[PDB]
From a paper:
HHV-6B U14 is a tegument protein that is 604 amino acid residues in length. U14 belongs to the herpes pp85 superfamily that is shared among beta herpesviruses, and has no homologs in alpha and gamma herpesvirus. The N-terminal domain of U14 (U14-NTD) adopts an elongated, helix-rich fold without any significant overall similarity to known structures.
The structures of native U14-NTD and the SeMet-derivative were determined at 1.85 Å and 2.3 å resolutions, respectively. There were two almost identical U14-NTD molecules in the asymmetric unit. To facilitate structure description, the U14-NTD structure was divided into four subdomains (SDs) based on secondary structure topology and spatial arrangement. The calculated buried surface area per monomer is 4146 Å2 (red), which is a relatively large value compared with those of known homodimer structures of similar size, at approximately 2800 Å2. One noticeable characteristic of the U14-NTD dimer is an internal cavity within the dimer interface. Broadly spanning electrostatic interactions contribute to the dimerization.
Numbering used by the authors:
A (entry chain B), B (entry chain A): 8 to 455
The structure:
Amino acid sequence: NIPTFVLDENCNFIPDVLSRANAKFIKEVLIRDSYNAVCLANSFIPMATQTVEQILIIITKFKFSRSRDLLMSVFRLGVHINRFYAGKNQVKHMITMMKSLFDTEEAMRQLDRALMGLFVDARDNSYMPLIALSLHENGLPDSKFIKAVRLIQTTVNSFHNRPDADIEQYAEKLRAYNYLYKIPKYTLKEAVDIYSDNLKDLTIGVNKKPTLLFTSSDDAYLSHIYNDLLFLTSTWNMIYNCKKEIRRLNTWIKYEINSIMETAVLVGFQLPDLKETILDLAALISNMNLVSPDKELFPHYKLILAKLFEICIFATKANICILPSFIKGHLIEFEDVLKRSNDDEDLNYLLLKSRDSDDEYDEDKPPIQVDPGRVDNVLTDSDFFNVTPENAFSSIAIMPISYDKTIDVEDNEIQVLEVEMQSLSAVVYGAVASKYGLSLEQVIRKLN
Amino acid sequence: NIPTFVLDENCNFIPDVLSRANAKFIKEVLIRDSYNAVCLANSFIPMATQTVEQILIIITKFKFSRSRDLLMSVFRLGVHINRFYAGKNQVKHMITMMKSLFDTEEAMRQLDRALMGLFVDARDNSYMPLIALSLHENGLPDSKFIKAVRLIQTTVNSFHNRPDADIEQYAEKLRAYNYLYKIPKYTLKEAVDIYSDNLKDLTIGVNKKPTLLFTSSDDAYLSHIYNDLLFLTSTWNMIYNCKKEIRRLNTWIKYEINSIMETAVLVGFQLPDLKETILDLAALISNMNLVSPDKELFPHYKLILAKLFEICIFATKANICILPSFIKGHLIEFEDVLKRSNDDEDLNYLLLKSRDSDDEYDEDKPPIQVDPGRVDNVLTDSDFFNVTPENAFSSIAIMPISYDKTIDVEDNEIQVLEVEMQSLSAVVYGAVASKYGLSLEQVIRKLN
């Protein structure tokens, strides 16, 4: 389904948005079909946010399937940010090009004359505010676009409308370079050919004013203006919806960025070497949230995405299984076991194999991993945890981690219990203790 | 790459876990490569949780990509629940089979005799705690298993060890029906063939006592015991880890189920006809959470999985774009706009275009969708929302919805601001109002 003209060596990431190195990382980790889908979803073609999501399928090669959960979130975010940035620059140029059609009195009077010609039998003068005065970036939201097109369509009894056979199928090419564009009911293939070039030009950002039929000749006057107005209104509606979709991307991005902070902290539980990277990430997101409501956030997006790719690359090279949901589930279990634990039971007993465990063979004495009275710390498993000796005894990056537990329903309101987890660091300390054969007290004693 | 024996028409879901209609739904919405991967990930082959995840890729046919976000979470959960159930039943049988090898006094004396023979030159009696007394379901965790195999390996100085040709690559087939099994350094291909059969039977659940080479032959005795002890210890280590992984799945499932409640609520924003289904889901999850620890939760898992599939099937039939992350992002933006608004700006003003908005054409008066002073309510878009007239004036299923906003860092500690969102219901009544040509006031007055 992928058009060859959206193929790109950098997966269509703008240099200002993502580094060459990071763009290469994406090609390294995805299977061919997924890479091609990302190319299309990240391409110059205007599309609604839901269309981006349908196309965007992120599938890693088998090698990197261990860190899919992380890579998917980050890559998705990157596509959103890229479309946001690219989109803004694109619609700006579209506005400049479409505005230039009638930015002189002579061009406006030409349009005035054409409108007068087509609307010669009009019931009233509604074509002025609905069409004539709405050919700008705020002029034609969906609701007003529908009315404008219906009004144009009433003028078919003022000229001999003889649509080309199969013009509907013929005009389908007008979405080749633009999936946001709503194709109106054109009548002339001659007109559609011109609008095809116009729309392609608008997407590419070609420095060439749009062509209209009624300003290229004098022939078949009214049918030419009829099709031209359909083009003008649909294209301005498309431009309006570009601005709307850019707003929708911006809104999503801010939430994706705030929510991924917990993801990064959870990754840092599996790979504590990332501590400084994660804290740097937190500072970047803090600075982003500090900004006044009116301002442009892209510079923050750029830095944040870069920092997120640092985390992905490291996590991928570590070759452990990055499963933030699995880790959080086990942090919850740890707190629950701790909460129900007895008083001849400290964290050392709960988190760590006893030193002479391998001397125990009694079946009624479950070893620690299957003992419901102790903790199966998945971070003692080499597939879920690694740290260098240099960072083994540093504090971890931490933020408040909680989850809401559904406990009742009152009519339409679901009741929950917030479970705040405040002893999380212990499982990481327990992982270090296990790796290096120490007690918890010994590990903690690394106050430094 | 998928083994032939794991291909299945119900995606290897146990009937008691998932209905045949729901298994068919899975087959309907996934592409073939994804369906086959799910078949393997959901198969009787013992695997570590991380191995399951590496294999489990959920890819929808393009027709269903609109709801991929929901389907991915529910199907993943389903596989986890299935593996938990199947796994518990399977390891119980494995234990019964392996236990039956030495459950009579005559069988025990034969083993003791075998043991003394092989360990004739042992330098202590550690073969008793490490091996003889650890042939049970709690006997051989990884740390002990390593020591046990190392001890067995020392006995090659007590017999003529001439390992078969090409045995270590030949033994590779012992993981065909078991990916959790650790393959030890066997020496005899006659041994490996017996163990291949044993392991295949164990995974399938064949009511047939395993075979040992030293109790089935006479020839070259000591090398037979040597291989048999490697089989016994590795198989019991595998059984122990089965128990461990079952516990890991159970831990993960509880968190997936609690977290998906919010996902379901968000889907209900887009599809309020699901309100009663969502409130029933909350009651099921509440019941599950009520259960004292640690009882068997599968009856609850079963019901909850079936209720989630109801949500999936309805959302998919609806053919709208189900993006909980996107929706939550826009709930957050609505809150912010609401907070920034003044007393001249009521919800009706913030959420709905004015009556005569399509008469307005001034460029310097941005229409509602691109006006930063008002809300672009994505639920007025037919791609994101639908409801039947019968449910248009029912209140939505609601739960507390919050997000942590990262605002500062000090040392290793990340500081956040909890943002709890009130008035979320208004975006739905705003969608209803827009859908049916009503004011917000006209909607809210009709609510109970």
